[PDB]
Curated annotation (Swiss-Prot), chain B:
Protein name per the record: Spike protein S1
Portion of the full sequence shown: 566 to 614 of 1273
Effect of D49G: Increase of pseudotyped VSV particle production ex vivo. Increase of viral load in hamster upper respiratory tract
Quaternary state and interactors: Binds to host ACE2. RBD also interacts with the N-linked glycan on 'Asn-90' of ACE2. Cleavage of S generates a polybasic C-terminal sequence on S1 that binds to host Neuropilin-1 (NRP1) and Neuropilin-2 (NRP2) receptors. Interacts with host integrin alpha-5/beta-1 (ITGA5:ITGB1) and with ACE2 in complex with integrin alpha-5/beta-1 (ITGA5:ITGB1). May interact via cytoplasmic c-terminus with M protein. May interact (via N-terminus) with host bilirubin and biliverdin, thereby preventing antibody binding to the SARS-CoV-2 spike NTD via an allosteric mechanism.
Residue positions with a glycan: N38
Function recorded in the entry: Attaches the virion to the cell membrane by interacting with host receptor, initiating the infection. The major receptor is host ACE2. When S2/S2' has been cleaved, binding to the receptor triggers direct fusion at the cell membrane. When S2/S2' has not been cleaved, binding to the receptor results in internalization of the virus by endocytosis using host TFRC and GRM2 and leading to fusion of the virion membrane with the host endosomal membrane. Alternatively, may use NRP1/NRP2 and integrin as entry receptors.
Domain of life: Viruses
Length: 49, 49
């Protein structure tokens, strides 16, 4: 099933990677956990000051 | 002046109206980089910040 149908897998895989890079280019809300961690640490530090 | 966290970052001189930044006096923790005292007594000091 691979060896009879691999080029469509190639186009789907490359188009899906392009979909991911478009999704990361469109929104910054995918990295909300990391931004939440950084905001939590900076919030705790500013709270300490 | 004031910084983000209620810190006096800048002052203006009263005799002559000049704006002076207050960089804090530079300070940091002293650490000792050493191997075991069973091996040697030569130490290396890493000054941070």
């Amino acid at each position: 099933v691979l060896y009879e149908n691999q080029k469509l897998i190639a186009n789907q895989f490359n188009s899906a990677i392009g979909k991911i890079q478009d999704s990361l280019s469109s929104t910054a809300s995918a990295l909300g956990k990391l931004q939440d961690v950084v905001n939590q640490n900076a919030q705790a530090l500013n709270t300490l000051v | 002046g004031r910084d983000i966290a209620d810190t006096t970052d800048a002052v203006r001189d009263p005799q002559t109206l000049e704006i002076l930044d207050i960089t804090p006096c530079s300070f940091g923790g002293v650490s000792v980089i050493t191997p075991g005292t069973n091996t040697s007594n030569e130490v290396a000091v890493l000054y941070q910040d």
